[PDB]
Symmetry: C2
Subunit: 174 residues, 2 copies
Amino acid sequence: GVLKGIYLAPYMQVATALIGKARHGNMFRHQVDTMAILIDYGYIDSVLLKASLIHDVIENIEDFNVNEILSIDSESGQVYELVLEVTKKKGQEKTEYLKNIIKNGSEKAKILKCADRISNMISLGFVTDSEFIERYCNETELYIFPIALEVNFEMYKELMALVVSRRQYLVECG
Amino acid sequence: GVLKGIYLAPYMQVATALIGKANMFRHQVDTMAILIDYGYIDSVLLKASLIHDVIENIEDFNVNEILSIDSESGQVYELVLEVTKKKGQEKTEYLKNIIKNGSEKAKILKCADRISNMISLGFVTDSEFIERYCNETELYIFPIALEVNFEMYKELMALVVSRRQYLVECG
Ligand SMILES: [Cl-]
Ligand SMILES: [Mn+2]
Ligand SMILES: [Mn+2]
């Protein structure tokens, strides 16, 4: 019963800045779904769940006032550090960012990236672009599968089943 | 904006009872997310959204776990009951009943619940199931969405069209 005592709502509030935005899906729902996936797999860690609610807020909001994170509570500093670990710097090679997370990322960053990827892989279900589904499937297999194998075998199984399912859709349709 | 002052985590705790079955836990949290997305910042509704399928999907569920949380737990329980189908009840007549007698909040909650379920059809293949679910959504939930929230109607519309388009372009 440790989850009852985690004050998440202020991090949800911050995440509402994303309401009205799409990345190939709905960025706000994606933050809350990422948190749901972490709780689903039994990660009840204050900093990780809090970071999960705003992990894309720095990346996807122009001129985002980082003090909106840092002013919330005594953990806001550890939350900010975790969000930074999974924020891609402007212009940085996506390949090298993912490679960098597996090499130097904390346990929590790796877990967060896996949950982020599960949520994004589920959102491919409503896409049609076809070439996008394939590139995203390949990226997930090459770079995220190994992260999931380090931190959580069950997360690896879900990522596996989602990649197989989407590749199967390409082959039976687009 | 009033979101900071809403005591949500204890209702999330309750929702973790659903971890294990079909994904019902994710569905509760996604339903709450959809409500926040559409700008519903109402204590009772967001709280109900986190546990709306707990009574429906857990046989011998100790309702006191809900009623002991806070001063609103009674209003939350009543809202959950409005969108709970009784053990033997015609699905048709339950949906008809929600549009006839359901509160504004029950109707909104059902729309958000349906949006979330319609998004989860994206990983299904059963084909006959997709069609029945699409038809059920068009006939019984579209009109609910038209009463309470036009934007929710547009999302339910686009999801039904998207899934029907999939059926037509393969099996
Ligand atoms: Cl909370
Ligand atoms: Mn993300
Ligand atoms: Mn439901």
